[PDB]
Subunit: 321 residues, 4 copies
């Protein structure tokens, strides 16, 4: 399939490189993160990707406790991204990096990126760190409501990307560093953060919000029924502030991508849960090979009509292209 | 379907009853947990369940920090269960409650339950608490290897059941108590505990072990591919002690049940990931209605041959009930 | 789900009533007749109780397609269409109509479709497979040359064509000899309709008229499950197909066809279809009165698909297709 | 996956070679002829390269079923079976055999099956649909009364019967008139075989002989997808079916049939079949030489199913069915 749109495609600036074992693989990953116009573009041309929506790596800004520095790095990453997109505006679009440890500053930067730089959304690596940085700040909190109101006003999607939990909140993984990151920790952290947004009633207040999750929903589709229906015999209204069910907000305010989850069985389950209209192709490059993502997607067992929607038209519609 | 086997069916004793909002629902749940020979049996007769493998509620013994007390309560709960099953041996089987905060005591009690009481396995509610009870004790730790060796020798399954993480290990849920328990926390806690067992190399050392997970695998099937294959271009071997991949241990040493997860889409995904031969019917009664579980299972969209296997024969084979 | 659209819902006129006599055993015949003749009463009450807002009505089978005499066929089609228009006018907010066509006379059929669409406001046509004409001993399929003008008009009017089943003629039914239970909905209906559909595709009809929309009931008459094989059998042979059409069967099926859930309330079948043709081309339907409306609706309300797709398959796909 | 078992793998003898002519034009015909006549060389090299340990061989089609003269049919069947036995003996560790049967003569077919199984060690029979006999203008289906003794012997010998496709006679193919491209594997093969299978079911054959094992290729010739409708159409009518069988079509399909992946390398189709008949009754097969072995193997190695089921469908279901353990 040609003309695909991919939207969990990362790059980095020297300031955030460290954020992402020594040897040839680490050297290659660094090269990939810094490259946009050469290797990346050639792979897009060879693997049917017309549009790549770029985003800064992780944890990047979300791991910068000093709001002053976080704002600085965010603006810097966004300016660099704007310059890179300008080189091939027919192929590259961008997601804004935001200094959410400072709600007002984040709202202002999103406005600048969207209104002045033409960015089409925001990508944030989970909770923010601020001050001593020992407290994970989730976006369902009160201080972020004004921000969400602006996101809805600008009407651009918010990509809730993973990050690892803080050490004090990672004891279950002690002795197992191999369970951190994309193996598992990333999914748990992101899935719960998403559930917090839903449970808080954020989508009752701002029903037009569009949230995007990668890695096929971080496991949510498979357990969505249970999330709402567990202990069904108990006919008492849910205790959370949100007015409806989790499945309602997931079905109406979320979209998921195939980033780093090239599994047909997983895609089929998602198609039967959230629907093909809300699944988007993505690769997670440079952490995943573009050819791996594309070759899998070209052959996965779905209707050709859905391969076109998931690979291209769903995204073009979502980002008003 | 008649003649089903259900194996995540709970009961409680006064001592552990408290482990399980005020009103009529709370009163009903308590009654259900204390009943075995009446209400429960009538529902089994009405909903095609021939065999029910019983287990104590949660967290129960795993939440008793004092080793002596934990050993006492486990003992009491197992003796009570043994007596209840003896009243109707053709309908009730039992899972042992174990005081794992004391590895040796736990091994001794499992042998006692299996060899002397005829129990067919063990059910443990996640990590154990001991001493000050502020440290979650996972079973992949070195001190539990002798125990696992005995489990394999006795050749009985180990049901790794959920429990909530300790407060200091649940900040991500702060302000959202509705995310604890069956809504989500139970799955994360159990899924990771299972992955720790796999990564530790436990199944290389004891390959004949049979581990059971409820709630359709606590989310594992859907993300299993990613667990091993993420960043596939990096051809460097994983650094965990285990010699093979997570999918290998999941496919070879685990079985999942339908407890509290009556969703056809989820069952189809599991069938295409772990296979119908490793999926077992279960309800999670009394936390779930038996009729809800049975009615869903009778109509779910699978082959009739698989409905027979998942509903009865997989369990009969696993617990050697045909000989 | 409320607000559903159903489009394989039948009725009969006195002149075609007996055609359904063999569909059900005795004792049930009286009830089936009542169902076929009723449009405004029981039918509407079932629609209100089972979340159906719009019902696109069609004459029963084989009806017009089994009338060998051209003059008579044209007469019955016009009468059936006039009656249907009268019935729809009584409850225009709930009933729409498919035209009955005397295709044993191409020109007349073309004229009648135009009348139904332009003057009566019908939204498409429903035809029970091949036509019989003259001695009526030869099945007339619509891929034949004489029907090209007709298809051009269908495309011009831009209304869908529902290719409904009918049993093959006795001389073309020997494989079922001694097994009358295999005729009809059990199996014969599907084979007859599936192949007729393939004949249309292979003939190149959709190369000539790419905007045509064909609808098949009973979840595609078995086509989705075997579609890959239909094109890819003997794939090692790198030679072009031998039929007139320029492309593959899957292309025409994916681009010119839609299938309904009529009389095939099976979740596994629906999942396969979703993974082959896609939810955007699957439509809810019941096959009332040959199938119970409650059976169709209750199954559809609980089938294992995404809620977004339940809305599309149950309502929006049809509203989009019929420009409602 | 290595160690697979494939069971819809054909060959031909000079006497039946022309039956496969019409299929491919030129050059491809030369290649197909080579493939059909070869058993020990190219075929074996492909098995070694594509993880196939066991290949259960069968004569091509329609072959014996299209020989109306009883004596000639018996002769050709015996000749094909003797050649097959000789070929299998060259490499018994890799090749097994299905018997060709002269069913236009029930007693003769019964005797030949006994000879093949008891004396030649064949593991089953493969028949290309209905038989032609005498004037050959009437399709002879195996649900007919005269074949009951034969079926009783099949059950006694306890070997599977592979009901393979064939095209219907011209007078029974008018629906395909003008569309020769719809005959054969494109569609006609499936319709012919699916209905023949339903006739066996409806006749009550499996009530009388419940231990029979029937095998269908091409993923069941379309049956799984429409199985619910076959039994449940017009469900509101609460009256029993009119056929002689005591139970439902789905019951006989579930209990007496097995389907193979021959010439139907489609994951969606396999998933539907897994959710209808179950992975325990699906078997890997290729339909070589009409289909490429690498096409079948490559698809099966990557299809979206549980690894445990890949092992069963690719090898253990067959080994259990043919008692190879
Ligand atoms: Zn990423
Ligand atoms: Zn439980
Ligand atoms: Zn109909
Ligand atoms: Zn074949």
């Amino acid at each position: 399939m040609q003309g695909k749109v991919a939207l969990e495609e990362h790059f980095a600036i020297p300031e955030t490189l460290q954020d992402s074992v020594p040897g040839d693989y680490w050297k290659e990953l660094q090269h990939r993160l810094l490259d946009i116009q050469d290797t990346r573009l050639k792979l897009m041309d060879a693997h049917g990707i017309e549009t790549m929506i770029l985003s800064l790596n992780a944890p990047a800004v979300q791991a910068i406790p000093d709001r002053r520095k976080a704002i600085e790095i965010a603006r810097r990453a966004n300016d660099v991204l704007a310059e890179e997109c300008a080189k091939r505006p027919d192929r590259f679009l961008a997601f804004a990096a935001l200094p959410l440890q400072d709600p007002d500053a984040a709202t202002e930067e999103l406005q600048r990126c969207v209104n002045d730089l033409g960015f089409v959304g925001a990508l944030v690596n989970g909770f923010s760190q601020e001050g001593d940085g020992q407290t994970p700040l989730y976006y369902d909190l009160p201080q972020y409501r004004p921000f969400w109101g602006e996101v809805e006003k600008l009407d651009v999607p918010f990509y809730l990307h993973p990050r690892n939990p803080l050490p004090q909140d990672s004891r279950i993984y002690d002795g197992h560093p191999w369970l951190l990151g994309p193996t598992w920790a990333f999914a748990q952290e992101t899935a719960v953060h998403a559930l917090r947004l839903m449970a808080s009633g954020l989508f009752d207040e701002h029903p037009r919000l569009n949230i995007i999750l990668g890695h096929m929903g971080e496991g949510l589709p498979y357990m969505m029924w249970r999330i709402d229906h567990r202990n069904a015999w108990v006919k008492l209204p849910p205790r959370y502030p949100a007015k409806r069910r989790f499945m309602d907000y997931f079905n109406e305010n979320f979209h998921i991508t195939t980033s780093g989850n090239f599994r047909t069985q997983t895609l089929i389950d998602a198609i039967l849960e959230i629907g093909a209209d809300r699944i988007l192709f993505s690769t997670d490059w440079p952490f995943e090979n573009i050819d791996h993502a594309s070759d899998w997607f070209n052959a996965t067992s779905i209707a050709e009509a859905d391969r076109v929607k998931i690979g291209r038209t769903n995204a073009r519609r979502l980002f008003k292209l």
